[PDB]
UniProtKB/Swiss-Prot annotation:
Disulfide bonds: none annotated. This is 2-5A-dependent ribonuclease. Endoribonuclease that functions in the interferon (IFN) antiviral response. In INF treated and virus infected cells, RNASEL probably mediates its antiviral effects through a combination of direct cleavage of single-stranded viral RNAs, inhibition of protein synthesis through the degradation of rRNA, induction of apoptosis, and induction of other antiviral genes. RNASEL mediated apoptosis is the result of a JNK-dependent stress-response pathway leading to cytochrome c release from mitochondria and caspase-dependent apoptosis. Residues 236-258 are annotated as: 2-5A binding (P-loop) 2. The nine ankyrin repeats also called 2-5A sensor constitute the N-terminus 2-5A binding domain. The protein kinase domain is predicted to be catalytically inactive. It allows the homodimerization. Changing K223N: Reduced 2-5A binding activity; almost complete loss of 2-5A binding activity. It is linked to Prostate cancer, hereditary, 1: A condition associated with familial predisposition to cancer of the prostate. Most prostate cancers are adenocarcinomas that develop in the acini of the prostatic ducts. Other rare histopathologic types of prostate cancer that occur in approximately 5% of patients include small cell carcinoma, mucinous carcinoma, prostatic ductal carcinoma, transitional cell carcinoma, squamous cell carcinoma, basal cell carcinoma, adenoid cystic carcinoma (basaloid), signet-ring cell carcinoma and neuroendocrine carcinoma. The chain holds residues 16 to 325 of 741 of the full protein. Residues 212-225 are annotated as: 2-5A binding (P-loop) 1. Induction: By interferons. Virus replication in higher vertebrates is restrained by IFNs that cause cells to transcribe genes encoding antiviral proteins, such as 2'-5' oligoadenylate synthetases (OASs). oligoadenylate synthetase is stimulated by dsRNA to produce 5'-phosphorylated, 2'-5'-linked oligoadenylates (2-5A), whose function is to activate RNASEL. The gene is RNASEL.
């Protein structure tokens, strides 16, 4: 019982040794008899996981030769193979395939190597996984989710993190389905506009629209791409979104508000003016909203378009 406690320390040390990239210390601890397949209690991480996360092939090899299980999963269900995708290591993906990993295996949240590679903008890994049979259009199914016959896709992921290079490749080279929808009915376009990154959102939006993305999808709360473009207060997105010949300008959100109503509630002078060069002012309480806003430049615009 004093030995059971002392050893667990050696184990944690083996992990820490790996994290510190202390090759010699890892060799001592393993030769010393430390459990090479020890999993810490937090998230089920092993030395091998940590080694893969860090893209240290040499430490992976060492651990494997001391008998590390190459397909042992951590608590989230992710395997070392998957972790190597997040790391973008082709060498490690090639390796874990050779040791029994399935190219379309997934953690307990439906995440596949291919998906992780797109999330982390890992191009070479993406191309590798594709050419090794990765199912590009898989929709995330948690495990106790498949059993009940019941949703995001790699394309969506790349859209939310704003990886332009990856999005081009998925759409042009790998046959990604631009108009797939998750279980809340959001598509790659909606995800791009929901993300925290206004960084490359213009490119992602243009790209998606060229590849025939549906500008008229109902999101979380009736929120269309137009309404998100407006709520973002982005003139460029509203501008590009409106060059879509068949966009339901007057579509209404969850609250009944529309692209124009929200444009005016938010005092967007140019966006409201641009919308009015097509939008229906018959939401009605438009002018009354601009008046509550004390916005007489905007009250004038609304009336010229018959409110
Ligand atoms: N060396 C180590 N590195 C990192 N963590 C370590 C390390 N050593 C010990 N730990 C510790 O163990 C714990 C859990 O770590 P873990 O990563 O193994 O397990 C995570 C979590 O519990 C678990 C679930 O978290 P959640 O409740 O937030 O559930 C999340 C979400 O609701 C769900 C569905 O997403 P979606 O389909 O709706 O888009 O997956 C999460 N998720 C989001 N992006 C993911 C991704 N790219 N890949 C996998 N899962 C993702 O998944 C890990 N995880 C979460 N976000 C991640 C992300 N963005 N990229 C990679 N992995 C991610 C921790 O508590 C931690 O301290």
């Amino acid at each position: 019982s004093s030995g059971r406690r002392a050893a667990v320390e050696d184990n944690h040390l083996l992990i820490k040794a790996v994290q510190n990239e202390d090759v010699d210390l890892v060799q001592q601890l393993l030769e010393g008899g430390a459990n090479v397949n020890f999993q810490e209690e937090e998230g089920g991480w092993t030395p091998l996981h940590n080694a893969v996360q860090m893209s240290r092939e040499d430490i992976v090899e060492l651990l494997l030769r001391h008998g590390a299980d190459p397909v042992l999963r951590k608590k989230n269900g992710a395997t070392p193979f998957i972790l190597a995708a997040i790391a973008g290591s082709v060498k490690l993906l090639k390796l874990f395939l050779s040791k029994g990993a399935d190219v379309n295996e997934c953690d307990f949240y439906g995440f596949t190597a291919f998906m992780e590679a797109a999330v982390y903008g890992k191009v070479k890994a993406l191309k590798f996984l594709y050419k090794r049979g990765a199912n590009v259009n898989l929709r995330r199914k948690t495990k106790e989710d498949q059993e009940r016959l019941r949703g995001a896709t790699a394309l969506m992921d790349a859209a939310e993190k704003g990886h332009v290079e990856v999005l081009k490749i998925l759409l042009d080279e790998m046959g990604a389905d631009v108009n797939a929808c998750d279980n809340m009915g959001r598509n790659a376009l909606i995800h791009a506009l929901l993300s925290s990154d206004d960084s490359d959102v213009e490119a992602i939006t243009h790209l998606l629209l060229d590849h025939g993305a549906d500008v008229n999808v109902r999101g979380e709360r009736g929120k269309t791409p137009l309404i998100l473009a407006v709520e973002k207060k982005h003139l460029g997105l509203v501008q590009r979104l409106l060059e879509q010949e068949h966009i339901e300008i007057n579509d209404t959100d969850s609250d009944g508000k529309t692209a124009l109503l929200l444009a005016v509630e938010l005092k967007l002078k140019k966006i409201a003016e641009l919308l009015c060069k097509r939008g229906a002012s018959t939401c009605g309480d438009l002018v009354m909203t601009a008046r509550r806003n004390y916005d007489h430049s905007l009250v004038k615009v609304l009336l010229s378009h018959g409110a």
